[PDB]
Design an enzyme around this catalytic site. Structure first.
Site, PDB file in Angstrom:
ATOM      1  N   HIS A   1     -47.580  39.289  55.793  1.00 11.14           N
ATOM      2  CA  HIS A   1     -48.581  38.666  57.067  1.00 11.14           C
ATOM      3  C   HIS A   1     -47.781  38.207  58.109  1.00 11.14           C
ATOM      4  O   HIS A   1     -48.171  37.068  58.995  1.00 11.14           O
ATOM      5  CB  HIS A   1     -49.465  37.532  56.205  1.00 11.14           C
ATOM      6  CG  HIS A   1     -50.421  38.012  55.360  1.00 11.14           C
ATOM      7  ND1 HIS A   1     -51.533  38.367  55.259  1.00 11.14           N
ATOM      8  CD2 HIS A   1     -50.080  38.161  53.904  1.00 11.14           C
ATOM      9  CE1 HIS A   1     -52.261  38.877  54.399  1.00 11.14           C
ATOM     10  NE2 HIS A   1     -51.215  38.806  53.136  1.00 11.14           N
TER      11      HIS A   1
ATOM     12  N   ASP B   1     -47.799  43.263  51.831  1.00 14.49           N
ATOM     13  CA  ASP B   1     -48.076  42.728  52.964  1.00 14.49           C
ATOM     14  C   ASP B   1     -47.721  41.326  53.079  1.00 14.49           C
ATOM     15  O   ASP B   1     -48.065  40.537  52.301  1.00 14.49           O
ATOM     16  CB  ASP B   1     -49.600  42.646  53.174  1.00 14.49           C
ATOM     17  CG  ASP B   1     -50.036  42.285  54.413  1.00 14.49           C
ATOM     18  OD1 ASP B   1     -49.221  41.664  55.178  1.00 14.49           O
ATOM     19  OD2 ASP B   1     -51.197  42.370  54.904  1.00 14.49           O
TER      20      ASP B   1
ATOM     21  N   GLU C   1     -45.817  45.731  55.025  1.00 17.92           N
ATOM     22  CA  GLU C   1     -47.111  45.532  56.278  1.00 17.92           C
ATOM     23  C   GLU C   1     -46.688  44.202  56.902  1.00 17.92           C
ATOM     24  O   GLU C   1     -46.523  43.150  56.181  1.00 17.92           O
ATOM     25  CB  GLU C   1     -48.390  45.335  55.760  1.00 17.92           C
ATOM     26  CG  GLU C   1     -49.197  45.235  56.564  1.00 17.92           C
ATOM     27  CD  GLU C   1     -50.878  45.449  56.182  1.00 17.92           C
ATOM     28  OE1 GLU C   1     -51.636  44.293  56.589  1.00 17.92           O
ATOM     29  OE2 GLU C   1     -51.173  46.212  55.234  1.00 17.92           O
TER      30      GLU C   1
ATOM     31  N   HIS D   1     -57.561  49.833  58.941  1.00 23.51           N
ATOM     32  CA  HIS D   1     -57.541  48.656  58.100  1.00 23.51           C
ATOM     33  C   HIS D   1     -59.137  47.984  58.066  1.00 23.51           C
ATOM     34  O   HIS D   1     -59.694  47.974  58.750  1.00 23.51           O
ATOM     35  CB  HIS D   1     -56.906  47.745  58.832  1.00 23.51           C
ATOM     36  CG  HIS D   1     -56.720  46.235  58.507  1.00 23.51           C
ATOM     37  ND1 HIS D   1     -55.765  46.023  57.514  1.00 23.51           N
ATOM     38  CD2 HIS D   1     -57.175  45.122  58.476  1.00 23.51           C
ATOM     39  CE1 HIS D   1     -55.696  44.700  57.251  1.00 23.51           C
ATOM     40  NE2 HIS D   1     -56.843  44.352  57.853  1.00 23.51           N
TER      41      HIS D   1
END
Ligand SMILES: [Cl-]
Ligand SMILES: [Cl-]
Ligand SMILES: [Cl-]
Ligand SMILES: [Cl-]
Ligand SMILES: [Mg+2]
Ligand SMILES: [Mg+2]
Ligand SMILES: [Mg+2]
Ligand SMILES: [Mg+2]
Lengths: 374, 374, 379, 379
Positions: B185, B183, B209, B285
């Site tokens: 972000h 991830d 991600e 999520h």
């Protein structure tokens, strides 16, 4: 000339034969797909026979359209399979009445022989190699293997690597001398699809058959844009509109229409000619019995764009003219006898129908898994 | 049966619980996303309670629609988060009134257990490995790591290489035995996006991600056309129309709807069924509290296309039935108790609400940086 | 666990088939597949799908639905989805009776208090149709469905267009804008005649034109709709959610009409209705003639916000196998939510069995040139 | 540096909220978020965004706007963008007062000398609407906005279409082409009835049809517009520039109506107006009822070349908290540029405080079937 009777016969493997009799004593044979819903398909055949009994079998076009659209909603997996079997038998009748093989009615030969590939199994990679080396000395160089090393789903990197390692070992045994396609049965997870295909690329299979089960035909195009490897598909498609959508989206290099599922000869000849309009090779799918194989051959021998023919070699049991389906160099010759060119042992069909015998596969999490074959 | 009172409770981490009471003495619990705008979300809940007090909690569909569309413009981040918390509590009430877990009301189990992955942190690559090796002996093999080696933005080749070197060291510790997703972000610059993804490819993460913050959903499709690696996204989406646009553009292999943000159970069950129509895996999520985790599980256990479930393991504090969320082999079992299946310690919620406590990150140039997590 | 023990089918007189699913705790659910035209095939489908049901827990409807749909065979199609639809209806009926509530309560509760119904009116001449419409109008009805063509046959001539319009014109003159009617053409209009018929029907303002042609491509509806202000209704010939998505993605259909006895039952139709909400379309379920399946439709209407209208066929004939007839009574063209647990039908099982003993079994219509006409509901 | 010291909100009687931003050099800016229906949530949003403002230099409006928009939370939405809009208005008000000029002077100066206004006219009957229109016409007005439906409720019948048309027809007969009017339907038309209503309104030539349906997809407007010669207006339900881009990319909307109190204030609305110029669309800002936000609208109109019309709500009621009432006076339906530094409003702060003490606080409308109607401005 009038249709008098339809009889279905369930047979020891996953096969059903049907028999259309006429008042002239001319008998046709067809073979529907049943794997799985045998009693439903059988009921469909006998319900559709209401449209056949006392009709001229020569109006195949009329009878096909009546079955497909005139009494119900347009057919899906069940009805199209039933229509396919009936269609095959009406073509058998027609070719018998006129004393020629089916391909002769459909414009004649576009080729002298047809290239075949065989399915090869084996639990270990060494077993798969051995079976391929056996058929190679027999004359074959085109094969189809299961991509799945084990029973289940390709979920992890570890599962991708094991499947690729199996393929690697198989390839190293032959180099570029033989060709093989890999069938995954749609048993690859959507996240794994692209990495698996990329990891198989050095070992250069002839095609990848059904990597995933597509909900939109855009995903085959998306998969193909990533790879040099040809995507093969078509066995789960019945309507012409199923094929058109797949072909217009692109991403499928090799089309695999099943004669026994997609509406038969009447319809598969049309699918073949539609495939021509796109830049797509045709490889009709048939791993069933001898009637359906023969039906495929007649499509192959009239369609210029047919390249490879699947056969599963058993289907020699109920056929008296076994030599007509002999293979030299992995090539089959055209059917010789009038109709479909299968001399059916009717007596051996009748006696083995008297004895009549698929489980649910689930993931680790308990969820039902999409259907595949054994 | 009528709703009597709504109470919100701010709790020591970045959590807010809400409590819906009824005149039958049946109590529901929900959990909104607040990270960042806690007082606004709290106000939204209490403004929407005007539509709830003195209404039958059983009309969840009516109450959901009233909150979403009847008194204001359609909700964004704030209102959808508020609606999500209220929705969860109405489902808790309904399942308690009928004495069954929520999944039972929604058609029952589609699976027996659900696969979970955990987030693992660590300042050094060695720390991340250690935490993963700890959970591995615990039974896990699926993880989620921050892609960012340091705090900030991936701007340079030097920043790409350092991030890739960290990932390389982590991968070399396990090989293909474990799986991990990365991830980022959205903290990768648009010029760096493609080269970073390409450089991570040998080390084969399960997903990437949110590589960038997309303004058009076409950029995920453009990123995915370049890579074999699956792109995961969905945590910043609230409307069904946000998800539809992302799904129709393609390029997102794994969808990540947040139960506590995207309108709750009523809405996330619909998002799940929409995801089915595209060739996209579902991984809801949730890194929040126990009420929201439980809500996710009920979506997981009714939707066939859910594959992985995020959990952050703390959330064991306010729950009395801790054993119901025990994990064997990285798998969670279905909730057992009526409603959401969380026995909330109301007293420990009330007492810790009495004590009530995010900074702005900027680039080197002084410009404000898009929001991320710690 | 609670286990399914037996599935039993019952062919009944107005060509209906009832399905009975029994459990070992004595809880019985009822379902209804639509069979018109292939009764024996669907019956065989139901009994073959029972193999995945006997011994299994009826509460796991999602698992069982997925098992019937994808596990043992290729997906979908008109035969299997009708069979799955009937089993789904009964499974949910079980779930509602076990938990002592109507089905809509399980599916998130009421989204409305009552549901607007409309009925099909028949009659060979416009004078007959008018009279039937007035008979229902006195009972509070103001929405209707009619057939667009006077008799069986394809509209392929200007003369046939003009006669269909004249009929509709005469029906409209008796009411003006005081009533609404939709027109169903059952796909019996030639694609050359489609746009002119639709255009000629515009001054008489039908609420919708249902199934003007049989669309091969999804783009067909979008091309027709771009020519007209009249709404196009479709849905009855669609069996999977993915067939519905395609048509919705193409646009051109303003009113979607999923059949609950054909498109996989409640489990799938609630998802279809949810899918339709993300498009600018009204939902109006194509409900089959029988009461069990009507009950299934109502449960979907009472949880789907985008459901606007509900087709039903009332006389005096629908309510014969139902003992709790008052639960499906209409006031001002509206139906109340089902009251009893499950689907809300108290089935007269002893009448069902009685009449299943006395029930016998395909009308194929041809053009003047001798070729078969594509199948229509008129059969 | 100059520092922001305090933000204060004031709920005021016609359901308005005023915002006051103070600085440590004594310079005060005023802003106005629209609150209708969620007053307490927006109020809480304003005070939470103040955390990014207290102690910061008000001159860095770009930095502060970006900080409120993307730094501490997920982006956008109807609550946060309304709050950001109010803060933006006040920050720019500060900047203009510090530099001793109107806001438009900072934004590149005048692009026109005066701005064409139009007003909304109400009335239950057409006779009332006509009279109100004539009352404004005598004062030089020739452009108007009306509601398309006589009362609250959805247009879902031919009868309701016909009644809406008859009203508009009767209004048109009193004037002919001597006046222009737009029709706002507030999304209260069923998607099946949309194309027929629009078509039936064509002989009476409204200047635009505003918000005929609530479009789920952007392609909805394009499909409606391809059927008609009448312009479609939309914009009030759009909060981000990226929502505006999508609708503009789809086509079908001829007049874009961004709300300055909802779509992020002056900073974002000047960019929206700039974005619209690259498409074949007219700009007509959906201005809120209050004067501070009206001032914000004018500054955008006086710098955007593609701004053509400006909606305002004048009586006698708007000008109560404004001391410099003559600055917003109208001649021939035109407004002059704001004259005073900043937004150009001299706010009676002592009246604002006085009336904030005496201000109290959601009308939910339902269809006959009992389901909720999507929210409209009529509340
Ligand atoms: Cl079928
Ligand atoms: Cl919001
Ligand atoms: Cl089928
Ligand atoms: Cl917001
Ligand atoms: Mg295969
Ligand atoms: Mg994330
Ligand atoms: Mg119909
Ligand atoms: Mg408006």
């Amino acid at each position: 000339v009038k249709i008098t009777r339809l009889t279905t016969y369930r047979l020891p493997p996953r096969w059903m034969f049907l028999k259309v009799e006429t008042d002239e004593g001319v008998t046709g044979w067809g073979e529907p797909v049943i794997e799985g819903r045998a009693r439903t398909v059988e009921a469909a055949v006998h319900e559709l026979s209401d449209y056949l009994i006392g009709q001229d079998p020569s109006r195949i076009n009329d009878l096909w359209q009546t079955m497909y659209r005139a009494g119900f909603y347009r057919g899906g997996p069940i009805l199209m399979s039933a229509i396919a079997g009936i269609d095959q038998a009406l073509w058998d009748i027609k070719g018998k009445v006129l004393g020629v093989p089916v391909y002769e009615l459909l414009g004649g030969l576009v080729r002298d022989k047809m290239r075949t590939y065989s399915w090869v199994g084996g639990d270990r990679p060494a077993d798969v190699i051995a079976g391929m080396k056996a058929l190679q000395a027999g004359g074959f160089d085109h094969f189809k293997l299961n991509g799945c090393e084990e029973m289940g789903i390709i979920d992890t990197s570890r599962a991708v690597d094991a499947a690729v390692a199996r393929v690697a070992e198989i390839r190293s045994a032959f180099g570029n001398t033989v060709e093989f396609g890999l069938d995954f049965h749609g048993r690859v997870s959507a996240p794994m699809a692209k990495v698996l295909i990329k990891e198989l690329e050095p070992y250069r299979p002839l095609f990848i058959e059904e990597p995933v089960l597509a909900e939109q035909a855009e995903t085959y195009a998306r998969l193909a844009a990533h790879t040099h490897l040809p995507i093969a598909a078509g066995e789960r498609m019945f309507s012409r509109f199923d094929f058109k959508r797949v072909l217009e989206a692109g991403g499928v290099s090799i089309l695999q229409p099943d004669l026994s599922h997609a509406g038969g000869i009447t319809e598969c000849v049309k699918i073949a000619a539609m495939a021509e309009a796109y830049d797509v090779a045709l490889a009709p799918h048939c791993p069933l019995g001898p009637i359906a194989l023969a039906a495929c051959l007649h499509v192959d021998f009239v369609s210029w764009n047919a390249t490879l023919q699947e056969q599963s070699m058993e289907l020699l049991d109920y056929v008296r003219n076994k030599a007509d389906f002999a293979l030299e160099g992995g090539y089959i010759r055209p059917p010789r006898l009038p109709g479909l060119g299968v001399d059916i042992d009717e007596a051996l069909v009748i006696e083995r129908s008297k004895e009549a015998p698929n489980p649910v596969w689930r993931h680790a999490d308990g969820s039902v898994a999409e259907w595949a074959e054994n």
